[PDB]
Design an enzyme around this catalytic site. Structure first.
Site, PDB file in Angstrom:
ATOM      1  N   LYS A  92      29.513  22.909  33.767  1.00 27.41           N
ATOM      2  CA  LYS A  92      29.518  24.261  34.349  1.00 27.41           C
ATOM      3  C   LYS A  92      28.530  24.387  35.503  1.00 27.41           C
ATOM      4  CE  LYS A  92      31.138  26.972  30.468  1.00 27.41           C
ATOM      5  NZ  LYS A  92      30.791  27.509  29.096  1.00 27.41           N
ATOM      6  N   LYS A 136      18.360  33.482  20.813  1.00 30.01           N
ATOM      7  CA  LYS A 136      19.230  32.711  21.683  1.00 30.01           C
ATOM      8  C   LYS A 136      20.577  33.401  21.561  1.00 30.01           C
ATOM      9  CE  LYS A 136      20.900  28.153  22.989  1.00 30.01           C
ATOM     10  NZ  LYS A 136      21.237  26.800  22.499  1.00 30.01           N
ATOM     11  N   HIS A 139      23.012  18.246  25.770  1.00 27.40           N
ATOM     12  CA  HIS A 139      23.289  19.662  25.981  1.00 27.40           C
ATOM     13  C   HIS A 139      24.725  20.006  25.613  1.00 27.40           C
ATOM     14  CE1 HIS A 139      24.561  23.049  28.715  1.00 27.40           C
ATOM     15  NE2 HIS A 139      25.319  22.151  29.317  1.00 27.40           N
ATOM     16  N   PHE A 140      24.919  21.136  24.944  1.00 29.69           N
ATOM     17  CA  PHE A 140      26.265  21.622  24.613  1.00 29.69           C
ATOM     18  C   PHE A 140      26.745  22.540  25.780  1.00 29.69           C
ATOM     19  CE2 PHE A 140      29.657  23.863  22.591  1.00 29.69           C
ATOM     20  CZ  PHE A 140      30.124  22.996  21.619  1.00 29.69           C
ATOM     21  N   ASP A 141      27.809  22.150  26.475  1.00 31.89           N
ATOM     22  CA  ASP A 141      28.246  22.941  27.614  1.00 31.89           C
ATOM     23  C   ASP A 141      29.299  23.981  27.323  1.00 31.89           C
ATOM     24  OD1 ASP A 141      27.517  23.093  30.467  1.00 31.89           O
ATOM     25  OD2 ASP A 141      29.570  22.531  30.888  1.00 31.89           O
ATOM     26  N   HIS A 175      22.362  21.899  17.536  1.00 35.23           N
ATOM     27  CA  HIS A 175      23.814  21.906  17.399  1.00 35.23           C
ATOM     28  C   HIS A 175      24.477  21.111  16.286  1.00 35.23           C
ATOM     29  CE1 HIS A 175      23.855  23.987  21.273  1.00 35.23           C
ATOM     30  NE2 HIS A 175      23.138  23.007  21.783  1.00 35.23           N
ATOM     31  N   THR A 224      26.392  26.976  19.492  1.00 40.97           N
ATOM     32  CA  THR A 224      27.465  26.385  18.718  1.00 40.97           C
ATOM     33  C   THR A 224      26.944  25.270  17.779  1.00 40.97           C
ATOM     34  OG1 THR A 224      29.018  26.815  20.560  1.00 40.97           O
ATOM     35  CG2 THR A 224      29.634  25.050  18.972  1.00 40.97           C
ATOM     36  N   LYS A 255      16.470  17.412  20.198  1.00 38.13           N
ATOM     37  CA  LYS A 255      16.645  18.838  20.359  1.00 38.13           C
ATOM     38  C   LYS A 255      18.134  19.178  20.215  1.00 38.13           C
ATOM     39  CE  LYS A 255      15.309  22.222  23.827  1.00 38.13           C
ATOM     40  NZ  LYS A 255      14.412  22.176  25.036  1.00 38.13           N
TER      41      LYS A 255
HETATM   42  N1  LIG Z   1      29.729  27.499  23.670  1.00 38.45           N
HETATM   43  C1  LIG Z   1      28.432  27.309  23.870  1.00 38.45           C
HETATM   44  C2  LIG Z   1      27.836  27.621  25.142  1.00 38.45           C
HETATM   45  C3  LIG Z   1      26.509  27.442  25.270  1.00 38.45           C
HETATM   46  N2  LIG Z   1      25.758  26.979  24.221  1.00 38.45           N
HETATM   47  C4  LIG Z   1      24.301  26.840  24.341  1.00 38.45           C
HETATM   48  O1  LIG Z   1      23.803  27.997  24.997  1.00 38.45           O
HETATM   49  C5  LIG Z   1      23.111  27.598  26.214  1.00 38.45           C
HETATM   50  C6  LIG Z   1      23.284  28.644  27.277  1.00 38.45           C
HETATM   51  O2  LIG Z   1      24.627  28.599  27.790  1.00 38.45           O
HETATM   52  C7  LIG Z   1      23.737  26.258  26.544  1.00 38.45           C
HETATM   53  O3  LIG Z   1      22.950  25.541  27.461  1.00 38.45           O
HETATM   54  C8  LIG Z   1      23.848  25.624  25.162  1.00 38.45           C
HETATM   55  O4  LIG Z   1      22.666  25.217  24.472  1.00 38.45           O
HETATM   56  P1  LIG Z   1      21.829  23.889  24.928  1.00 38.45           P
HETATM   57  O5  LIG Z   1      21.993  23.723  26.500  1.00 38.45           O
HETATM   58  O6  LIG Z   1      20.377  24.077  24.627  1.00 38.45           O
HETATM   59  O7  LIG Z   1      22.600  22.777  24.276  1.00 38.45           O
HETATM   60  C9  LIG Z   1      26.364  26.642  23.004  1.00 38.45           C
HETATM   61  O8  LIG Z   1      25.655  26.171  22.093  1.00 38.45           O
HETATM   62  N3  LIG Z   1      27.704  26.833  22.850  1.00 38.45           N
END
Ligand SMILES: Nc1ccn([C@@H]2O[C@H](CO)[C@@H](O)[C@H]2OP(=O)(O)O)c(=O)n1
Length: 124
Positions: free
Chosen positions: A66, A41, A119-121, A12, A45, A7
């Site tokens: 975060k 969404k 996950h992208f934070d 990303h 990024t 995912k």
């Molecule tokens: N600068 C950022 C901040 C957030 N996210 C995405 O938007 C969601 C909500 O903040 C995050 O959890 C993350 O996707 P994901 O967790 O599914 O990687 C991102 O892609 N880029």
């Protein structure tokens, strides 16, 4: 189903381009990657680096996420990324985004074995 790791790549990773090609980029990619299927969404990024480079971030700088968890890591080097942010004319299902290319450090949460990004934070 889809694993956390798959995912992450889906949402990303974009190694086929090194920069946010055009103003169309986010509109095309958010749709293409199925990120506008259930809702638009808000922010997403895309990273224009090789997958090996991004996975390596899990062994880089350990920083607080975060959400307070501690499995987040910051890249020592800046990476090429495209930031996608939802505009105002954006009304589901007609999602609209602003494409923004930048070079910044990425912060990802990692887990599992192998320890890979899930996950992208943030980007800083
Ligand atoms: N600068 C950022 C901040 C957030 N996210 C995405 O938007 C969601 C909500 O903040 C995050 O959890 C993350 O996707 P994901 O967790 O599914 O990687 C991102 O892609 N880029």
């Amino acid at each position: 189903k889809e694993t956390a790791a798959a995912k992450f790549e889906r949402q990303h990773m974009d190694s086929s381009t090194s920069a946010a090609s055009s103003s169309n980029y986010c509109n095309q990619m958010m749709k293409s990657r199925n990120l506008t299927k259930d809702r638009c969404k808000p922010v997403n990024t895309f990273v224009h680096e090789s997958l090996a480079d991004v996975q390596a971030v899990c062994s880089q700088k350990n920083v607080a996420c975060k959400n307070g968890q501690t499995n987040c890591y910051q890249s020592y080097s800046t990476m090429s990324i495209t930031d996608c942010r939802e505009t105002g004319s954006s009304k589901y299902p007609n999602c609209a985004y602003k494409t923004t290319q930048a070079n910044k450090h990425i912060i990802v949460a990692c887990e599992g074995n192998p320890y890979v990004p899930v996950h992208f934070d943030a980007s800083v």
